[PDB]
């Protein structure tokens, strides 16, 4: 049986509020092994956290995680956690527990907004290779998920990182080249899927 | 409990695939213990958007499931990763760890990519669409598609006046086929700025364009 830790699943939250997260872990005494917290911020580095002695239940921070950060656990439970109170938008960031440099956690996704659960509109971009495509505008949160002709279309298909625009609200197009010859004949659709808003879109791009 | 710093190097590589790279982690302490003869140093992999995978520990031994063109080496306070053989699924972020001291500290990372002929983009300009400017607003698109290296240049400009502070860029990974890269502008107005301009271009700027080139349209055509 091989060592595994369940992290809880994606978390939203506004600022001001308090998050608890945990780590769940099976295949071994727990209590022989101490667990780690790593933050990982969204195109940057990895920041250790800390660790919790899982015999004592012992805390050590790192300084920049002194006071709105607790470890705890509860051992009968083989679980640890990691709270976070008084939450900023800069703790929005994937979290993984670990036993160490050995064995990490899947990660818990951590998205802290004032923004509220939004779907997005979809707008066409029109178009011997021509470019059209899909604009998928002011969604919350992420993700989206585009496909094109039912997934069917994958070759010359380029989705690209959403942008955080200052409404708050994330925004993103996807586009594909085709053969010009094509766009008599063949029709072209993309499906858009936002789950959070429970929005799905397919929509039709033609040529004006 | 000491704060020691790792130092990676370089910050960013760019190799052809199939050749040899090299990646450097320094300490300022030594990670040596004389107790056990081991280098408490690690190095991770990190994918676009995937979490950290452990490649080699105790600064050489490499990970199950990690393949043989990986080779960690070193001691004390230095300490290398190579790629003997650099492939294009290796496009990731490389970061060293240590956990000799508390509290434990990563490097500040290397990231890797691959290297090919440089290629130039393929610009496509979007006007806004009807649909959309029934809600008050326009995006103009701007497409810079399948291009190396990744350093591109693109400015808006509204009947030849140059725009600022109103568009915004997002750009792909290294594609894994072709190795190039793709990025969009969007240009964001209201409605009624839209309405007032009637000349909307783009120009993008690339090593592999002998000269800047434009896209642009006329609203109503
Ligand atoms: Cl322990």
């Known amino acids: 049986l091989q060592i595994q830790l369940v992290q809880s699943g994606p978390e939203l939250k506004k600022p001001g509020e308090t998050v608890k997260i945990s780590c769940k872990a099976s295949?071994?005494?727990?209590?022989?092994?101490?667990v780690h917290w790593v933050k990982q911020v969204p195109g940057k580095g990895l920041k250790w956290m800390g660790w919790?002695?899982?015999?004592?239940?012992?805390?050590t921070y790192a300084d920049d995680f002194k006071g709105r950060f607790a470890f705890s656990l509860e051992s009968s439970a083989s679980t640890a956690y990691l709270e976070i109170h008084n939450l900023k938008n800069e703790d929005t960031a994937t979290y993984f527990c670990?036993?160490?440099?050995?064995?990490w956690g899947l990660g818990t996704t951590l998205t802290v907004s004032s923004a509220s659960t939004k779907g997005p509109s979809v707008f066409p971009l029109a178009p011997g290779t021509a470019a059209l495509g899909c604009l998928v505008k002011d969604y919350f949160p992420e993700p989206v998920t585009v496909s094109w002709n039912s997934g069917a279309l994958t070759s010359g298909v380029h989705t690209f990182p959403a942008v955080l625009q200052s409404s708050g609200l994330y925004s993103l197009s996807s586009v594909v080249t085709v053969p010009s010859s094509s766009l008599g004949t063949q029709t072209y659709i993309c499906n858009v899927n936002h789950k959070p808003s429970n929005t799905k879109v397919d929509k039709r791009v033609e040529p004006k | 409990r000491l704060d020691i710093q790792l130092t990676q190097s370089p910050s960013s590589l760019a190799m052809s695939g199939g050749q040899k790279v090299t990646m450097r982690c320094k300490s300022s302490?030594?990670?040596?213990?004389?107790?056990?003869?081991?280098?408490?140093l690690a190095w991770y992999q990190q994918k676009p958007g995937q979490s950290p995978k452990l490649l080699v520990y105790?600064?050489?031994i490499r990970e199950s499931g990690v393949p043989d063109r990986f080779i960690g080496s070193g001691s004390g306070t230095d300490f290398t990763l190579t790629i003997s053989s650099v492939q294009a699924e290796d496009l990731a972020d490389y970061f060293c760890?240590?956990?000799?001291?508390?509290?434990?500290?990563f490097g500040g990372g290397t990231k890797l990519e691959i290297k090919r002929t440089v290629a130039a983009p393929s610009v496509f300009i979007f006007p806004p669409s009807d649909e959309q400017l029934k809600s008050g607003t326009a995006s103009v698109v701007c497409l810079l598609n399948n291009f190396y290296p990744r350093e591109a240049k693109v400015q808006w400009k509204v009947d030849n006046a140059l725009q600022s502070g109103n568009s915004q860029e997002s750009v792909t990974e290294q594609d894994s086929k072709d190795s190039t890269y793709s990025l969009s502008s969007t240009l964001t107005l209201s409605k009624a700025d839209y309405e007032k301009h009637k000349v909307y271009a783009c120009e993008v700027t690339h090593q592999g364009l002998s000269s800047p080139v434009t896209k642009s349209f006329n609203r109503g055509e």
């Open positions: 919790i002695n899982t015999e004592t239940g012992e805390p």
């Open positions: 295949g071994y005494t727990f209590t022989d092994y101490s």
């Open positions: 302490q030594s990670l040596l213990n004389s107790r056990n003869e081991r280098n408490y």
């Open positions: 670990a036993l160490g440099w050995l064995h």
């Open positions: 760890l240590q956990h000799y001291n508390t509290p434990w500290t």
């Open positions: 105790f600064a050489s």
